[PDB]
């Protein structure tokens, strides 16, 4: 399903948002462009989520906790993207991890050991 249905329908979504009042040379052309951005923008996080799934199976750890392994990973990737503006990533990374890990009950909910592993896997995504 996620192999193709996304771009096909996502384009349909935008067409609807653009409205039937907008000539097709704009309606479709804008749609296609915005979709391409969705595909490119979405993928990086999608890759993380898929990787996380495999990590948990590898570790032999709970499926429910994916809600947080994912949240944790996704939050950090946003942070890693921001680091391309902040610079000094070494310090930014440590700081994001510091709370992402330490605030166990709200930022992890998952073993700090596995949370860090995710932090490391996410780091590798640049």
């Amino acid at each position: 399903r996620q192999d193709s249905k996304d771009r096909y329908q996502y384009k349909q979504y935008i067409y609807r948002s653009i409205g039937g009042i907008v000539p097709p040379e704009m309606a479709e052309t804008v749609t296609a462009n915005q979709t391409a951005q969705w595909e490119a923008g979405f993928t990086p996080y999608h890759k993380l989520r898929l990787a996380i799934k495999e990590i948990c199976k590898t570790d032999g750890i709970p499926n429910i906790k994916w809600g947080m392994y994912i949240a944790f990973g996704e939050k950090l990737l946003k942070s890693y993207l921001k680091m391309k503006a902040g610079s000094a990533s070494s310090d930014m990374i440590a700081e994001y991890i510091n709370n992402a890990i330490s605030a166990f009950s709200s930022r992890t909910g998952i073993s700090q050991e596995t949370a860090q592993k995710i932090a490391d896997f996410i780091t590798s995504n640049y």
Binding site: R16, S17, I18, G19, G20, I21, V22, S79, K82, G86, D91, M92, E95, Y96, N98, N99, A100, S102, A103, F104, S105, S106, R107
Partner: protein, 131 residues
């Protein structure tokens, strides 16, 4: 007034038009929009104003330049949301811990300093944040 209040009608304008261009029923749209503009305006301004107002007053008190408020405001809300998150999902000890650990986290940005630690303490003690 106008810069926080009129947003109701401007937001309304689009939400209606978005649907209107779909060939939808005028009445259903008016209803769906009404609910949308209410949820938008109400939830946004309630949570945001409480934080933004405290944030603005504190930062001004502390001689923060207008170009500096963005950092502290962007944090103000982010932090304020994490405060709710904890009040909702975590033990009181974790709410307190997270608040302090987040203040530390915020160091990732050049913005972070006393101003942030002061602001978060206020949010925790004062504001019933929506999230």
């Amino acid at each position: 007034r106008k810069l926080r209040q009129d947003s109701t009608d401007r937001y309304k304008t689009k939400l209606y038009l978005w649907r209107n261009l779909g060939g939808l029923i005028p009445e259903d749209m008016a209803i769906s929009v009404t609910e949308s503009i209410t949820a938008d305006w109400k939830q946004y301004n309630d949570m945001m104003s409480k934080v933004r107002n405290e944030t603005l007053d504190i930062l001004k008190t502390n001689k923060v330049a207008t170009e500096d408020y963005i950092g502290y405001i962007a944090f103000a809300e982010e932090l304020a949301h994490q405060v709710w998150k904890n009040k909702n999902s975590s033990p009181d000890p974790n709410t307190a811990n997270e608040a302090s650990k987040t203040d530390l986290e915020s160091k990732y940005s050049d913005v972070y300093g006393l101003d942030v630690t002061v602001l978060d303490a206020i949010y925790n003690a004062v504001i019933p944040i929506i999230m």
